[PDB]
Point group: none
Chain length 440, copies 2
């Protein structure tokens, strides 16, 4: 009912809302008792007035509870229920090696993920490059895999934090997207619906990032750690570098290639290593599967080096109806692009910057991403062999290998990639992959 | 399109909106091209950041030109085009007197109006307890009567400021009605579209004030005066008391009766007198039909004592198709209620408070108003011989005479009247009828 307008009026005048009041309104959104205009007004009043830590927690936990919430206490599993979440990036593929890695270390990873939003990639989209992959198993199969494999990566049923559906949509047309409380709500409500004991948040800083500035990434990470632990879920955040492409490849099929190679030890991008190992370590300590960073890293290094994690991945893949030989034979399964050639800079120099948002857009343009929610994706296109900041570039040393649908396509990404990368005469500042660790 | 959202962001960030941006939005609301959530978000940004003077004239005139705008210059009239507008209240019958009064003072008063909403009855619902009274003459009939009588009172014979409808509806459920620049536009746009040379605004203060506070009431009065003058109309406003019924009666038919009695001289409520006179003085001074209060009061006293104003009223009832002998014979025409009995307080003491809102809402529930515009008004029901603040009440002194279809609606209304009125052992302090005059 129209108690709603009174809660709006209350927030408007600068009064904090209560848990009952926030729950009412959120449930109002799910059940369509509350109009889009009422949705807009409250969002606006929250942009201006913001929200106290308690209001923030109430907002998240109300949204989480608006849908179905997962309970694994029933299954008496040997270890903690954990996950990672990330704000996104280009060539940020960490989840693919992380779920298996943590899972091979005794965690249980019910990773319910999503489709690529603009220039950033989706994890689901990458996995759909694997032939036969099912991101939508029945909830009970889903429980089988978790128990038998230890990780599964699946798509949102529709039953999950549904309040966010109408609330985010309205935010998008009303200029209320940018508010940290409303963002901490959207970001966390879904992940918390998984019934986790622990969570680590990856908050990217730099040009590629959601947040426009570092102090804002830091404000968002602190909000999230604050609200999550408040929700009963042990949580830390890492601030990690999105100033260049994290992996050496960006796309779908091409990212899954580098995932397998990483696990099997075929190839490991040192920065992608830094960020993946850092996120996992946070998962193992916050789940008491390790005493300390050193012991965490000790376990993780082993599972990664001896193929365990690779096996876990294959098994999970097999389990989700992908090839049973996929880890070994990934070669023959993944789509390859019809045109794959390197692009070279017009000058020699050291790479001193790149616009990572731009590169990411080059990939959507080639077909690797959607602008529309219904755009179809070509899984073969993208970049590989990406050059890194401070790399020496010349006629021998290409900026990247572009994978495209045709020559038309390839020439255009070749423009974007040359324009997005900046060359200098001196190897610039060498930036840390991980900036700080944020806790309660 | 959805640069509507960009307008919202601009206002949100604290900028002034252009006239152009404001007419794009206003017209977008009339034309459906902008949705409910955007309306509500913009409204809320306007609640927070207010608006400047040219913003305000832009809003009001964008609304005004969203629909037809009258022009009287063709009919070549001697004497000014002048009207009265009011935020409304229980028992405010001033229009029915003042129209004839000022018309009889040589000016032209095209009062255009609406039905009742909430606790306040519309002037047109009052005029419609007169048998046959026609609130919808067609265009030349409207023009004819004004030339002849000098006044007429009608509903909107056209669409005057259509953009106000989605905008007020959305405001009324989003807690955005309280915004002075938005109110001002609503309240003024319909009146400016009337093509007036002058206007006086009656802003009620007290328990019947539209605004939550007296100090919000001044600002409203002050904002209306500024914009109207900025819109080209010579405008002043009075802040007048609604802490109780203005007239001695409230209803439709019962109000018409007292209304007529005022004019013919049978009874004149001093407080109703105070306000009516002062509003008329404004119309005469601003419409340059007199040079100061003193001269203006002379003239209106004359037409009140010499019968010309009462006369103007009858002509106007016959011209508008109610009985032509109505002034003389009104008790033959006006329907009596089914049950008339005085209602008594259950304690003894002075009347300290009167909840006027609760009173109109008592009339509505009697069948006096309409909560749906689809209802059936019973024109007879209502209240007469209202007790007034400061009156000493005992077992022989009635709070009012109640007029109700049956004893069951009587006993419900009586309940409401005793809920309307607070007694206690000390008489309250007096209040002026008119608090202040606002010009320039
Ligand atoms: Cl008298």
């Amino acid at each position: 009912m129209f108690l709603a307008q009174e809660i709006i009026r209350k927030k408007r005048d600068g009064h904090a809302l209560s848990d009952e009041e926030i729950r009412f309104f959120i449930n109002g959104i799910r059940d369509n008792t509350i109009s889009e205009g009422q949705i807009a007004a409250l969002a606006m009043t929250i942009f201006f007035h913001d929200m106290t830590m308690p209001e923030r927690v109430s907002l998240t936990m109300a949204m989480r509870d608006s849908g179905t919430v997962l309970d694994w206490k029933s299954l008496n599993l040997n270890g903690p229920i954990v996950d990672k979440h990330s704000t996104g990036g280009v060539g940020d593929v960490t989840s693919l090696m992380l779920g298996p890695m943590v899972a091979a270390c005794g965690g249980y990873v019910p990773m319910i993920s999503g489709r690529g939003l603009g220039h950033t990639g989706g994890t689901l989209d990458k996995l759909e490059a694997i032939p036969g992959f099912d991101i939508f198993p029945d909830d009970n199969r889903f429980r089988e895999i978790i128990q038998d494999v230890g990780v599964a990566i699946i798509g949102q049923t529709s039953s999950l934090a549904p309040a966010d559906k109408r609330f985010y949509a309205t935010r998008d047309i009303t200029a209320t997207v940018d508010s940290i409380p409303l963002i901490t709500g959207s970001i966390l409500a879904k992940k918390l619906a998984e019934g986790l004991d622990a969570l680590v948040m990856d908050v990217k800083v730099g040009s590629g990032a959601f947040m426009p500035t570092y102090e804002l990434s830091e404000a968002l990470a602190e909000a999230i750690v604050g609200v999550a632990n408040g929700a009963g879920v042990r949580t830390t955040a890492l601030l990690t570098d999105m100033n260049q492409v994290l992996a050496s490849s960006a796309g779908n099929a091409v990212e899954v290639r580098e995932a397998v190679q990483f696990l099997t030890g075929e190839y490991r991008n040192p920065r992608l290593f830094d960020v993946t190992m850092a996120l996992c370590v946070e998962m193992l300590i916050s789940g008491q599967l390790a005493k300390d960073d050193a012991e965490a890293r000790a376990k993780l290094q082993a599972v990664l080096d001896n193929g365990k994690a690779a096996e876990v991945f294959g098994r999970m893949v097999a389990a989700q109806k992908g090839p049973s030989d996929f880890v070994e034979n990934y070669d023959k399964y993944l789509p390859t692009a019809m045109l794959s050639k390197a692009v070279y800079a017009d000058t020699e120099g050291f790479i001193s910057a790149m616009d990572t948002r731009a590169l990411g857009m080059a990939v959507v343009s080639m077909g690797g991403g959607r602008r529309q929610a219904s755009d179809t994706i070509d899984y073969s296109v993208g970049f590989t062999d990406m050059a890194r900041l401070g790399d020496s570039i010349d006629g021998q040393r290409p900026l990247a290998v572009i994978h495209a649908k045709d020559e038309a396509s390839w020439q255009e990404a070749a423009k974007a990639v040359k324009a997005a990368i900046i060359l200098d005469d001196k190897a610039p500042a060498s930036t840390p992959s991980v900036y700080r660790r944020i806790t309660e």
